[PDB]
Amino acid sequence: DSVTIFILVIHVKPPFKLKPHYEKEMRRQLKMQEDGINKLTVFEWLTNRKTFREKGRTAQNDARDAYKRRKMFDYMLLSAENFKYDEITKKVEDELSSLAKGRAQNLEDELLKVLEGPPKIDEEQQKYIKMNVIFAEDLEI
C-alpha cells in the first residue's frame, strides 16, 4: 500500500425541511445530490462554488433597470421587426447614460472551516480529498 490518505463528516445546516409521492421524490433527489457531491474532490467542488458565486452582482439599480427595460419594451412593441439583445441593450444604456447565505453557503463555510482547521489543508492537497457530506437522511418533516 504505502500511502497517505486525507479522510474528511459535514451535515447541511439547517437541514432540508418538508411540508405523498412528494417525500419519496425528495429523499430520492437529495440522495442523488448527496452522492454526486461525494464523487467530487474538495478542489473540484470549491472551484465549482467559486464559479457559481460569480453569477449576480439596489433600489437605485432596480430603478435603473426599470427605466432601461421599460424603454426596450416600448421600442419592441412599436416595431414589428425584432431587435437583437446585444444591440438594443447598448442603445438604451447610452440613452440613460445621457441623463445619468443559506444551506449551500453554510456548506461552503463549514467546509472551509475544516480546511483551515489545523492542520491547514493546501490547494494542491484539495485535489486529493473527497467530499464527505450527508444531508439527505436529515430531511426534516
Binding site: 432540508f16 425541511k17 411540508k19 412528494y22 421524490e25 425528495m26 433527489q29 437529495l30 442523488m32 445530490q33 454526486g36 457531491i37 467530487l40 473540484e44 467542488w45 470549491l46 465549482n48 462554488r49 464559479t51 457559481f52 453569477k55 449576480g56 452582482r57 439596489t58 433600489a59 439599480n61 432596480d62 433597470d65 426599470a66 427595460r69 421599460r70 419594451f73 419592441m76 412593441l77 425584432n82 431587435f83 437583437k84 439583445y85 446585444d86 441593450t89 447565505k101 443559506g102 444551506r103 449551500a104 453557503q105 456548506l107 467530499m131
Partner: protein, 196 residues
C-alpha cells in the same frame, strides 16, 4: 393578446384548459394581463417543452419565502422553463408590480416590467432574449443528449451548480420539477440580481 406568443410556439401540449373558478382562485394575487393570459393559454408545454404554464399553487408556497424586494406583498409563479427556472408575478405597491425571473440554476433574479404582452409576444419568441435574459440557448442541445421531458419533469443538475456541480451535460438528469425547484430554493438563500 397573445396570438404572436401562441403562434411562434410549435409543438404545444395543453394539459388543462383554464376554468374561471381557477382564475378566481388567484384574483387576490393576479392581475388582468395575467388573467387574460390564463384565458388565451391553458396550462401546458409551449415552445417544444421549453416553457410550462403551471398551476401557481404548485409552486406558490415554495417561493413566497423568497426575498426579492422590500415591500413585496405576494409572488405568483405562473411559468417555468425546462431547466426549473421560475417566472413569478410580484405585487409591490412601493416599487410597482413586476415579474421576477428566478434562474434556479444560477440562483439569480431578473426584474422585468409587468408588461405581459411584451414578455410573451416579443421577448419569448426572440432567441436573442432567450439567451440574453433567460440563458436557455442550449435547450435544443440538452434535449438532443438527455431526452425529452414531460410537463412535470425538468433537467436537473446533480449536484446542482449551487452545491458545487459542474454544469456539464454529463450531470443532467430528467427529474420531477416541483421537488427540484423546492430543493434548489432551500439551497440558495437570496436570489441576487442577475448581472445583466
Amino acid at each position: 393578446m397573445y396570438e404572436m406568443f401562441l403562434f411562434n410556439s410549435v409543438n404545444s401540449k395543453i394539459t388543462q384548459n383554464v376554468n374561471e373558478e381557477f382564475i378566481l382562485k388567484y384574483s387576490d394575487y393576479s392581475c388582468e394581463q395575467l388573467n387574460s393570459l390564463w384565458k388565451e393559454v391553458g396550462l401546458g408545454s409551449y415552445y417544444n417543452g421549453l416553457f410550462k404554464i403551471i398551476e401557481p399553487n404548485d409552486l406558490k408556497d415554495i417561493i413566497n419565502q423568497c426575498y426579492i424586494m422590500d415591500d413585496d406583498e405576494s409572488l405568483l409563479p405562473f411559468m417555468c422553463t425546462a431547466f426549473g427556472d421560475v417566472f413569478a408575478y410580484v405585487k409591490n405597491k412601493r416599487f410597482g408590480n413586476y415579474v421576477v425571473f428566478l434562474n434556479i440554476r444560477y440562483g439569480t433574479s431578473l426584474i422585468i416590467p409587468d408588461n405581459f404582452v411584451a414578455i410573451f409576444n416579443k421577448v419569448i419568441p426572440n432567441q436573442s432574449f432567450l439567451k440574453g435574459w433567460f440563458d436557455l440557448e442550449n435547450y435544443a442541445f440538452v434535449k438532443e443528449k438527455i431526452g425529452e421531458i414531460d410537463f412535470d419533469e425538468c433537467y436537473g443538475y446533480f449536484p446542482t451548480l449551487s452545491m458545487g456541480g459542474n454544469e456539464s451535460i454529463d450531470n443532467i438528469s430528467i427529474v420531477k420539477m416541483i421537488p427540484y425547484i423546492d430543493m434548489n430554493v432551500q439551497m440558495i438563500d437570496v436570489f441576487e440580481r442577475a448581472d445583466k
